[model samples]
Target: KAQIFLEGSPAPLFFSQVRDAIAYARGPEQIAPILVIYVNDMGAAGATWDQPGDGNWIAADKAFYVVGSARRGGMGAPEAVPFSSRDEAAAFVLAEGGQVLALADITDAMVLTPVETGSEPRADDE
Candidate 1:
């Protein structure tokens, strides 16, 4: 899993960076399945979804997904999901494009990490 931090409003450069990272991760392979969880401060107060080109964030060919509330505040609410494959993840984001806060590798983490609480919910749970 990979995580990237961004600031200064939204910039096309941000999307470019994300695309590059995703492409690099694919590395000529058969596009291995990957679940991308976008975490950001969107649902927090002061946040707004009035960007001029919000649709540009979604790349049809890539694999990504978005799970965030449209609330306005300081990261008010959080969201997550488990993608069956990288393409599916990407398709999700493309369909409901929005700002991407961070990406995580939930699949591997879940497999390697021990369950301390016994009832710890999977990352797919919001």
Candidate 2:
């Protein structure tokens, strides 16, 4: 059988950490303008707080949105989006056949939110 191992923190929170790490990787230009959507299930047979179900993982941007279920057989992809405003990012997800889970403003994850420009709106908005 194929089994996956996440030897760190639990789901949701673990996923959150992953998102932050990704953001850091993107650097300043791509910073503070992204969001991570995590889709997962909590009541999976082998579910653990740190490692839950088959679809447990994390992806990050500026705004962090994690979507997971505390019930059995619940799994989905937590989408990621980079936007200037939370509402804009959220709208894109909704338009792109995705559902909103949770939104976290992480402009200050490292130190504090910084001023940025040249950010463009998502193409899906059209």
Candidate 3:
């Protein structure tokens, strides 16, 4: 019954192109700072990669994901932090008392919906 816990969280916003998501983040609001890019070749880009740095993208389909229970700093938002390496992601989980999830392990009904800067976080999904 393991699910991508953060999949439903408002913090994560998916995207078809990495550049577009980054552009939204860099827009007036500037809401997000950390980004976990999806770097697989399976299909089109389905998620945003904020603040692309040296090691911020997910390079594999079967890698460990650290869903931190702790809210992001300052912004006070949620996130599903991903890692292509086991030890690295595990350390984050260990420190934050979070859970480590894999792609197949997740059971949430998630669609790679692109980000809409005009939309607000909805409290009701109905």
Candidate 4:
């Protein structure tokens, strides 16, 4: 099973199958979908799939993720940064001004205070 937390949508979306979830994750749509697969460990081991097929999935327990209420554009999700350790994640937040979130907390997170998107380093219109 998988849990999908889409941007702009508050409640979590549930899927009993990973194949279906993967289909929903990517598509021809403009707004990219953000999802947390296998919200529970369920004894699934680490595996990779080059093509969609049968598999057991699990939520991440070894990484710390940084997220904020900010988004990039009309259909953008809050920028996400994954760090191997809590200290690394905290260091990032010290500079970026956001909180590090665990996999469990992601279900309750959604758009908070609106934020302005920063421009890229190189000016495109120059």
Number of the predicted model whose TM-score against the real structure is largest:
3
RMSD of each: 14.7, 13.3, 13.4, 11.6
| Off by more than 4 A, model 3 | 1-37, 40-52, 56-60, 72-77, 109-126
Residue pairs that clash (backbone atoms under 3 angstroms), model 3: none
Q: Over 4 Å off in model 4, which ranges?
A: 1-62, 69-76, 110-126
TM-score of candidate 2 to 2 decimals: 0.22
lDDT (Cα, tens digit) per residue for candidate 3, span 1-126? 011112234555445343343233334224444333343322112123433334444533356545454322213223444456667667775676255566445322221113334332222241
Q: Residue 86 in model 1: shift from native, Å?
A: 0.9
- Per-residue alpha-carbon lDDT of candidate 1 for residues 74-103, written as tens digits (9 for 90 to 100): 132222322324454344445542223223
TM-scores of the models, in the given order? 0.23, 0.22, 0.39, 0.36
Q: For model 2, how big is the CA root-mean-square deviation?
A: 13.3
lDDT of 4: 0.41
| lDDT of candidate 2 over 59-104, digit per residue (tens) | 2232334222222112222213322344644554455413233334
TM-score of 3: 0.39
The top-ranked prediction according to lDDT is: 4
* Comparison by lDDT, 1 against 3, better one: 3
Answer with 1 or 2, whichever has the higher TM-score: 1
Give the clash count for each candidate.
10, 13, 0, 0
